[PDB]
Amino acid sequence: AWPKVQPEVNIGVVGHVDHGKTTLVQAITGIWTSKHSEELKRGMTIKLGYAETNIGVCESCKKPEAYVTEPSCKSCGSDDEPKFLRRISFIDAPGHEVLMATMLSGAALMDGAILVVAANEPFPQPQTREHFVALGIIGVKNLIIVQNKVDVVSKEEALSQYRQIKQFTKGTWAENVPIIPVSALHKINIDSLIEGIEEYIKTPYRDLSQKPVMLVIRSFDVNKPGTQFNELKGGVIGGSIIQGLFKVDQEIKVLPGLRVEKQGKVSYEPIFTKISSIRFGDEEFKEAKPGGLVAIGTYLDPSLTKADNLLGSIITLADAEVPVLWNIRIKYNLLERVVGAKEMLKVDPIRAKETLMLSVGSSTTLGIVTSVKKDEIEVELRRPVAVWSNNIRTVISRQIAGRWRMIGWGLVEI
Amino acid sequence: SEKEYVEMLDRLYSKLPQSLPNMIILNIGNTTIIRNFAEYCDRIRREDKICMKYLLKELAAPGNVDDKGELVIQGKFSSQVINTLMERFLKAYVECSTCKSLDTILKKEKKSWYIVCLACGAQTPVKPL
RNA sequence: GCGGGGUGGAGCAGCCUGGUAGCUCGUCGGGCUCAUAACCCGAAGAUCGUCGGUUCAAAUCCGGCCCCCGCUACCA
Ligand SMILES: Nc1nc2c(ncn2[C@@H]2O[C@H](COP(=O)(O)OP(=O)(O)NP(=O)(O)O)[C@@H](O)[C@H]2O)c(=O)[nH]1
Ligand SMILES: [Mg+2]
Ligand SMILES: [Mg+2]
């Protein structure tokens, strides 16, 4: 029987509306990423979800149907137990435009990407540009392109869109991102899809040397309605680890965490605690290694953490130090066109006192600029962001008709 | 690398839209004969070392598996009583918690024996016996 | 936690303290006025969500159930 190994790789599942995204993660895992009632009741992706699975290959059978993700080989007709490789998970993003910023969080976490295109929508849909440039600003050039729902669209139209998207590949960072045809519901060609994730998207070389940082994405009060005071568990903060690792009873701080009132003005309080639990899905590990969202509950009160309060915050070692600056400088190079836009106008350069949106790792902010230079800016924020490295990948947007569409790429010089 | 779409489509165009064996327990002399034990527990990946682990204690009678896979029991018993007895294996280790698919297997470990389900993968706290 | 609303074209009364299904805007008819609005009078309209128990006897005491629901959230 098959070992119990935490995921060592994340993959971004991004794409536009109705493309077959959540159904793709169902095709790979067997489970969906709609977890808040509104997500089902509206039938569209609003927030980022989670899903997990393994990978085993039958050394005897041919490719690729034997590439099944359970301790079995029966789909290729073999009796042998396949060779295990890993446990693989994903970041299921939205397609909507008022909801784009969210997936940007996940863009800083994924170690891969499977990007979908609609055979059954007019191509290129506007927001597809915004996903592609999201991957390009964050810089995960490792991409597997797929055309979806092929059961209603004929094989010639599939070929025409395949030529369109083979073209979409050439001329950019993605000259050789491949196209492997699958359908997310009927479980077709998903074996070749797993083979594609494997071959073309390998987990990076890990750096277990830098200060272990945990990038918050979600959090919950697991204390159920009716929880009496005897069995009170701490509030879980879930994310993914990128550099370092976490252990049982590690002394940490949540940064920034809470707001408190300080010195006649506003400020934040660094949230100190001891690590009490670290979960990967439905398996209990005592250590957390990089690759895949890692949920850590601690000795913190879940009132501070329930309902995605701290969204995107960072957490580091309680003997660490990170620059927390209320007003941050940015080297920003502006996009050449507005990518998710139905009609791509020009970029109107950013003038003083304007309002702009930032996503730093997973944390988000609104800000107004105070000193406008051509490439360098110093922007005053409504909350200081935690900049754990030099020139971190922030993603920046200006508001268009009520939809904050991106305007450039920025670097915080600390 | 233009062939990286053609054949994959050609075999994309070819995927478009187990039960309990009727165990017949017979008796001759003072033994128990069955028909399809090579494909009764081997339908659910159940070893011959592990399927005769709790049954030896629940019947208190010696016995072993054959080369074909059949299971011989020393004693006189009816047909529908072996299942009512071995319920503590048919429900305690080879079932699930939220699927009820019967397509499950057991694990062998150094601290407990888990229930790997090929429908969900739901386990329970139990100690092998 | 499981419980409530079950009733004229409607809006809700109306229980425990059992024998008029109760008052109001509405509906058609008649009065008053030179004529219209307001004001006075008369009839028509659910017959209580439904089986069942209590009960001489029930919206009125309640249960079984059919409908509408209703205070409520991913539980690493
Ligand atoms: N036939 C078929 N239907 C599919 C497939 N994928 C999804 N669907 C169904 O088609 C509808 C729209 O697809 P959807 O699952 O929303 O894809 P999505 O890209 O995740 N949409 P969003 O991210 O906005 O929530 C839904 O009813 C869904 O069940 C597919 O591959 N084939
Ligand atoms: Mg979706
Ligand atoms: Mg009048």
XYZ file of C-alpha atoms in Angstrom, chain A residues 1-2 64-65 71-72 147 151 155 158 162 179-182 186-189 191-192 200, chain B residues 1-2 4-5 8-9 11-13 15-18 45 103 105 107 116-118 120-121:
44
model
C 0.000 0.000 0.000
C 0.825 3.545 -1.245
C -1.316 6.870 -21.141
C -4.549 5.372 -19.741
C -3.631 2.612 -6.008
C -4.926 0.713 -9.039
C -9.057 23.347 -25.528
C -17.888 17.095 -27.399
C -12.891 18.050 -34.987
C -11.142 22.077 -32.838
C -5.796 24.677 -32.257
C -2.126 21.761 -26.555
C -3.517 18.398 -25.439
C -7.260 18.010 -26.129
C -9.457 17.024 -23.179
C -16.691 13.127 -19.661
C -13.199 12.186 -18.348
C -11.631 12.027 -21.826
C -7.888 12.261 -22.523
C -4.511 10.571 -18.802
C -2.589 12.499 -21.466
C 6.260 19.706 -19.058
C 5.602 18.991 -33.107
C 2.297 19.319 -34.967
C 1.138 16.529 -30.668
C -2.580 17.234 -31.357
C -4.438 12.742 -29.063
C -7.667 13.971 -30.677
C -8.142 8.873 -29.205
C -10.080 11.710 -27.561
C -12.805 10.602 -29.976
C -14.369 7.932 -24.759
C -17.746 9.513 -25.407
C -20.984 8.492 -23.563
C -18.466 -5.167 -9.428
C -7.813 -7.041 -3.477
C -14.468 -1.216 -4.000
C -8.894 -2.380 0.221
C -3.583 -1.429 4.431
C -8.048 2.730 1.337
C -11.210 3.383 -0.675
C -11.021 3.524 -4.474
C -13.108 8.480 -1.885
C -10.289 7.248 0.356
